[PDB]
Design an enzyme around this catalytic site. Structure first.
Site, PDB file in Angstrom:
ATOM      1  N   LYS A 192     135.350 139.199 113.952  1.00 14.84           N
ATOM      2  CA  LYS A 192     136.518 138.587 113.664  1.00 14.84           C
ATOM      3  C   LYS A 192     136.423 137.632 112.306  1.00 14.84           C
ATOM      4  O   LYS A 192     135.634 136.637 112.399  1.00 14.84           O
ATOM      5  CB  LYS A 192     136.851 137.502 114.853  1.00 14.84           C
ATOM      6  CG  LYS A 192     138.256 137.314 114.836  1.00 14.84           C
ATOM      7  CD  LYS A 192     138.423 135.947 114.274  1.00 14.84           C
ATOM      8  CE  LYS A 192     140.344 136.001 113.750  1.00 14.84           C
ATOM      9  NZ  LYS A 192     140.188 134.947 112.764  1.00 14.84           N
ATOM     10  N   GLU A 267     125.573 129.362 112.553  1.00  9.91           N
ATOM     11  CA  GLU A 267     125.355 128.704 111.131  1.00  9.91           C
ATOM     12  C   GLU A 267     126.346 127.973 110.777  1.00  9.91           C
ATOM     13  O   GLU A 267     127.597 128.378 110.757  1.00  9.91           O
ATOM     14  CB  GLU A 267     125.016 130.054 110.250  1.00  9.91           C
ATOM     15  CG  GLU A 267     124.047 130.867 110.674  1.00  9.91           C
ATOM     16  CD  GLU A 267     122.691 130.281 110.970  1.00  9.91           C
ATOM     17  OE1 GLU A 267     122.373 129.509 109.849  1.00  9.91           O
ATOM     18  OE2 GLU A 267     121.648 130.555 111.681  1.00  9.91           O
ATOM     19  N   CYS A 301     127.941 126.116 102.268  1.00  4.44           N
ATOM     20  CA  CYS A 301     127.117 125.405 103.402  1.00  4.44           C
ATOM     21  C   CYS A 301     125.754 124.964 102.965  1.00  4.44           C
ATOM     22  O   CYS A 301     125.366 124.013 103.209  1.00  4.44           O
ATOM     23  CB  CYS A 301     127.045 126.105 104.601  1.00  4.44           C
ATOM     24  SG  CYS A 301     128.568 126.425 105.442  1.00  4.44           S
ATOM     25  N   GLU A 399     130.393 116.577 104.866  1.00  3.13           N
ATOM     26  CA  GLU A 399     130.546 117.765 104.013  1.00  3.13           C
ATOM     27  C   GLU A 399     131.455 117.882 103.508  1.00  3.13           C
ATOM     28  O   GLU A 399     132.809 117.833 104.294  1.00  3.13           O
ATOM     29  CB  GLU A 399     130.093 118.943 105.034  1.00  3.13           C
ATOM     30  CG  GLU A 399     130.274 120.201 104.097  1.00  3.13           C
ATOM     31  CD  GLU A 399     130.048 121.527 104.866  1.00  3.13           C
ATOM     32  OE1 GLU A 399     129.078 122.313 104.864  1.00  3.13           O
ATOM     33  OE2 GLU A 399     130.706 121.616 105.988  1.00  3.13           O
TER      34      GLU A 399
END
Ligand SMILES: [Ca+2]
Lengths: 503, 505, 505, 502
Positions: A192, A267, A301, A399
């Site tokens: 997906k 992750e 990331c 972040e």
């Protein structure tokens, strides 16, 4: 801005308005409802560059049943490692055969510079090749020394049906970091992709079909987060969810999957530091700092989002860094010269700016950028550098996922380790130093799963990737990824009869 | 109805007179709960005899144990010691276990209701688990990649997970602590061990042995209490890096859910409904003994129990006959008797639950061949060895974990049918196949979805091999070399020697 | 000249009263040579003191030992035991080594001329070797290949090589036995150990400790005697499966050729001419100490000796000044004195050979900075710490293994030069690089063709890592996990379950 | 005999001669002297099918010098694993692209049936592919737990220059079992194929050139046993010799190699037993016994040359085996129907018959075959002996022809003792449907390449090699890379060690 490259909405490639279908049990299909989602090119305001189905819950469950039947009844897990390997090599070959087409899709849907997209497509063909080569050599253990009358076997087997959910920042790469290790382990898969960037993932499943990996081994569904995410995490017929994206979404799917003891691979995001010591190669480090924060417009990331700089070189490093930052080409994803492309969406660009605003209100010193660029033409955010950042500030901790660098100073290696670790994240870190002890001891003491010395971003299929702390669970790539998608069966084999219990 | 194979417990036994009191162990110190509250354990084998008391920890007591482990990991010597140094200290614990074997075996027997001869053997096995782990802890490695470019070197470094919360069950207290703690601390981790409220004695003694051996303060802490708050605290505390839980699917899923909220690593070892498959060509006397062992070991209070028998039609009668002969004679009862082979139920609530499953099996139409009642109600908590025949896959006794000495028997014709029936469960912890045929034994074992498998054997394994479940029976792998990976993080390092090619160009 | 750092042997030391008569150990029995012939060892540190005697084996005595190992392997229980069973017995040996530490250290000191403090540390290290190997012995594995077709299963089984002849040198007798025997018998092999004619006492004691621990008769046998017949017999006997030799290249090559006549496996650990490379950015005080240690350790009678110093031009004088200061002060002489750091030459023949090389160095034009003569000629065998400067790579002292406390110094300007100098040898055993620079330390060590490498250190290794040489310095790898592969055979099994497809249609 | 396929003298592909050159530092060259050696195709009238150079010692030294420079100075070992791997996959592809050309060369030069040769080349492409996949994943170890101030590294490196000497019986397979594991490890190679069968090996080196492998990485030299053999075992620029062939030649090279401490890998002969128990699948086992002994006309180190049969299925087995033995098409290697090809040479065909006559005079019962066949071609009839006893020469010695020695046994324990009563230990098969019998018997046989309910057919995934006099080292799988690697242990101190002098 002098270094901004304006897009050209008259590019012929924008006239290709690709329409895609999901792929479920070997068949290209629409959503039962016929509903679709459009993707507008983030680099080219208003230009529709892709459309795919918006799946219902029931559409996704059909993909799960196809993966289930493929695993329970189909040939794929029954085949030798070598047979599985040969089919996956064919996919790697097709990826190269279609490199230009695939790079164009990624560029248009993601806003990725086309030169960067082209390189990523070739790296994906290498990921498939690496995994294909390793798939046939997967092993367990014999224990020939647990008594003359016994033999210990540990057999490797596939986990089963894996739901793989991938983010918008590296769609093709993340599919290629997950799917080949899963199916190479003998698993079957439902993929997906993000609602923003499903084009190359559909093409990837179509290449596997063309290869032709059996029906239902590799399925792809498209849609928004909500139906598909919940479905894969709670469906009884799914054995594992491998999610890549934000901590917020990861933890939610994780909590849902735990309700039924479903294996989970995550992750997630990070707040990666690059630590630059005073004895580093200053020119190499400056360039690496820029690369670490600006790569993929900072929507990464493993971004080097914090620069931790030793007091003595802060000025000399800042000077080189600003200079690169002022000259580096950004803007039009279709221009071969572009190094930094577009923000993925308006809401995301807004999120990035809101952190730049919080930075300013915190008292951090804006040295460069901090505004949208070419607002009329598409989604672009200027290369942005803060100095005078302190550890408590929201820009040092959270972040941002934009091209925004936060700079903090230190005096000693012990301080730098303490700062690098003063985060709930633990995905990546770089250390720049020419000193054996400083480089190695610093990297050994940082709690991060993906580390670099005198480098950043660039890795290999050969080495494992994953996070410490809140940046993830499990390890992908290398030989480790196959363990993620495998179950291990310990067998105590008695040859003849055991000693009786009842005497 | 009295059974002649029942060994009545003796209220008189001197060993019951000792009312052992225990304290938690946090940061090297033996401590009560802040509140001073305690929990008593009455011996399940011997009605009304208190045989253990330990603190009822509050949430804050547990957080203090977490803090000690946190400090021992972040500032203490343990994770910075060499593998060899950690290994020597762990060997000293193994030697202390052997030195205290009879003391430890008695505690386990009194608290669990475990036959003393079985407890004695378990303590010996635990010293072996500790020795195995100590020997492997110093050899733990990662990888070099020396072929990724002349200018680059790839390193994969193995490091500890950090602070691990370890929750153990009442059925094999010392064993499960010894299957978890040595792998975690051997990997450089520090630990807060939380044993069952019923059975904390040997786990407190194990922590005291590690202190006696010279393991640094805060490396191995133990707290005691009810399931919560300890369970919740370990699953939610930001200073805990991982929870290693062993127990029921119900509790395991709930702690897993909580832990996922903060991306906490989780290891789960849960229940099962393990089948033993007996083919027509099996060694009949060995198989029958294995079936009895499989279901009655630990009074069936065993995640790897052979709770379903799948028997090939027409060795059915010959196997059943042998099984029933053994079941009539096997000594069950008084845990303190050296002749006892099957001991007590852990608690009255548990015994009622087992009996409730028996009654459900009857109402389902399963044929009760043996047992199905409590024995020596006045003397203690004992359930007779029980065998059902004519069980069909839809019955609650064929599907649900009873965790009592209760076997469900089903027949099959073909290997393929045996496999389908075996896998028709949401569980997947254990399975055994009995056959003298190469192809049947190995293909059948290859096709069963269970993590812990046996051919021509059951129950007994080795520290050398990994253990764990498929499906709802667990997450991760323990023991052997695998358990060390459960308590490790792996750091991938791309090392450029010199400088990379510039990005800005 | 008298050196004030010389510790004169004290002939009044009561330990010199000890007379020691040893026997061979074959099939669990202590035995003489059939002839009754024996060999005496005079202490090299103490003129005229007879410190050991052992049998002078005949070829037939050695074949008897081989036949006992053969019987132990073919019919006895050792290779059929579990890894765990073998491990427990080997841990008992490691425990005995510690219990007899002072006894063993004294034997080594007296027979070898090794300083007693060094000998004591070596015995402790040997106990650690035995412990490490015992830990690993139970976890040795092969592989399963569960992905080569539904109808097949691939197995790779690990099995022992069988009977191994182990020949050990006079410089580190206990160490080398302890780096070889535990890996071999831990793999399931049986062995015949042949130590040097000069230094058999600790090796016979080690076999006696194995017997004391309960290791089955014939698993670990020891024979004593001259180089031949033992060496020829072990390398030609049809009932020997492997020879593991440690000693000079000249002797190893000869045994290698003989062994090749019968396809006999060979592991060789031979001499070297190891360089230490000191870059301008090294920690100078540490590098200087490591240079001294590298060349003086065991009086330079050491295959991994840093016998060549390659020093960057800029720091040559600063390093030499520090090295010579250490060399003037370091205590050498009486091996029985606790202060002694450097002991005796093994024999008068060896001392003369060492002096022959020093005299060759002078005639070549090398600059003698220190030492270069015998010391205390009446009291025992001692050679002064010796340093040559201005050595160029064509000189015999740059090229040949001297095996005494004699350093050859050469300078270089660039890392590339240092690598070429380091590699300009037929040897390839060891090397050290001293540098604080990431790139130059790691790139230099990756480019040097030697199996045992050190950065910012020398001599000191761990049981955890493999040892062995490149080029003419050896064949095979010992220690860590690697040594078990040296004494194992691997059996690849393709298992068809059912029937393969017919060849004939 | 009606199962014989007579060789067709007129087949046109016998007339198409090929000439080959050596390949050294990327260049195709003849010997400095210009001298050449021909190969006559053994299944046919004296038809020359190949010619290649007769190298001098200096020619071989130049090939070694090219490998040495390629290793010391060239890009190959400094390339990433991935880069080597991509080039090796291109060779795998080229092998498949040229499958029919290569199968014909192998058929013509060794006398190997063309259907077998076709399959063999196919298998070689797979060997190269497996090896190419694995080459990029080769690793060493980190030891991160040997003290806070220290880091242990074990680095895997190439052994360097490897001389690879291959036999006449499986020229392409054995090159493909050795070269890819060596060059995959970062090594450079000098390949020396048999004087009889150099064609496919030269083509293999040219495919590597065509694929783009750097000059000097893969060299091929041709000629007689010596001087190439001696040069490879003696040259100080060679780091290792990997030899496959006979114990006699292997031991001599091993002795020479030992004089300079040269690493040696040896893959030698065998006397492989197949053990058939009373509970075995009788039809599969019978077919397996015929395969075992007749594959490659018995010219195979892993041949099932001894049959060990349990008393009481002996007669039912022997019946099935003879039925097969009499129907199996042997003869013309060029016929698509042939299952058993020709003998290698006149000297070898005669060696086989000599063992057969020595088996007769020993007292053994000849049930089938025992005769040379043909006037135009070297052939031997499928041959089965019964009543063989451990002491007979045909029971101990490697015949290397299609000659089965049958011995009976009563118990599993005797089957094992009989299987192990040999100086060899290369292969063994066990046929049984019994879990304990199959596995315990296989665990107890001292042989390196074992089979249960199968024979001959293996995988690239699994290691191969011998016990006892059948070899030294392990090839294939992950094991073969270790054969061509050196391991370097590094104790790295970060900062400074504690001082020795205090
Ligand atoms: Ca005396």
């Amino acid at each position: 801005l002098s270094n901004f490259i304006a897009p050209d909405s008259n590019d012929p490639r924008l006239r290709i308005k690709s329409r895609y279908q999901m792929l479920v049990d070997g068949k290209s299909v629409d959503a039962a409802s016929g509903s679709t989602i459009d993707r507008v090119s983030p680099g080219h305001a208003g230009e529709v560059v892709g459309t795919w189905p918006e799946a219902s819950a029931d559409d996704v469950r059909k993909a799960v049943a196809a993966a289930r039947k493929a695993f329970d009844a189909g040939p794929w897990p029954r085949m030798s490692g070598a047979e599985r390997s040969r089919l996956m090599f064919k996919v790697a070959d097709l990826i190269l055969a279609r490199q230009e087409e695939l790079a164009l899709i990624e560029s248009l849907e993601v806003g990725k510079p086309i030169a960067q997209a082209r390189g990523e497509i070739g790296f994906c063909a290498d990921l498939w090749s690496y995994a294909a080569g390793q798939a046939r050599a997967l092993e367990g253990q014999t224990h020939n020394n647990i008594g003359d009358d016994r033999l210990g076997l540990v057999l490797r087997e596939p986990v089963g049906v894996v739901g793989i959910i991938t983010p918008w920042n590296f769609p093709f790469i993340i599919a290629s970091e997950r799917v080949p290790w899963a199916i190479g382990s003998g698993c079957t898969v439902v993929l997906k992709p993000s609602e923003f960037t499903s084009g190359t993932s559909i093409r990837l499943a179509e290449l596997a079909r063309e290869a032709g990996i059996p029906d239902g081994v590799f399925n792809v569904v498209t849609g928004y987060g909500d139906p598909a995410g919940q479905v894969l995490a709670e469906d009884p017929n799914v054995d594992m969810v491998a999610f890549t994206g934000s901590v917020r979404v990861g933890t939610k799917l994780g909590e849902i999957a735990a309700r039924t003891v479903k294996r989970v691979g995550l992750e997630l995001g990070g707040k990666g530091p690059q630590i630059v010591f005073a004895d580093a190669d200053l020119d190499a480090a400056a360039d690496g700092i820029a690369y670490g924060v600006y790569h993929n417009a900072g929507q990464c990331c493993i971004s080097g989002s914090r620069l931790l700089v030793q007091e003595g070189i802060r000025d000399a490093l800042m000077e080189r860094l600003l200079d690169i930052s002022r000259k580096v080409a950004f803007g039009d994803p279709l221009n071969e010269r572009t190094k930094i492309g577009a923000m993925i969406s308006e809401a995301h660009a807004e999120k990035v700016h809101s952190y730049v605003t919080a930075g300013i209100t915190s008292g951090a010193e804006l040295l460069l950028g901090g505004e949208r660029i070419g607002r009329e033409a598409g989604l672009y955010y200027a290369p942005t550098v803060f100095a005078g950042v302190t550890p408590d500030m929201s820009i040092a901790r959270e972040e941002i996922f934009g091209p925004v660098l936060s700079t903090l100073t230190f005096k000693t290696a012990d301080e730098a380790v303490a700062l690098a670790n003063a985060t709930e994240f633990g995905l990546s870190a770089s250390v720049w130093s020419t000193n054996l002890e400083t480089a190695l001891q610093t990297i050994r003491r940082i709690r991060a799963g993906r580390c670099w010395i005198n480098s950043v971003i660039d890795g290999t299929p050969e080495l494992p990737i994953g996070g410490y702390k809140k940046s993830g669970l499990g390890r992908e790539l290398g030989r480790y990824g196959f363990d993620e998608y495998s179950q291990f069966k310990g067998v105590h084999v008695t040859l003849g009869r055991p000693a009786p219990w009842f005497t």
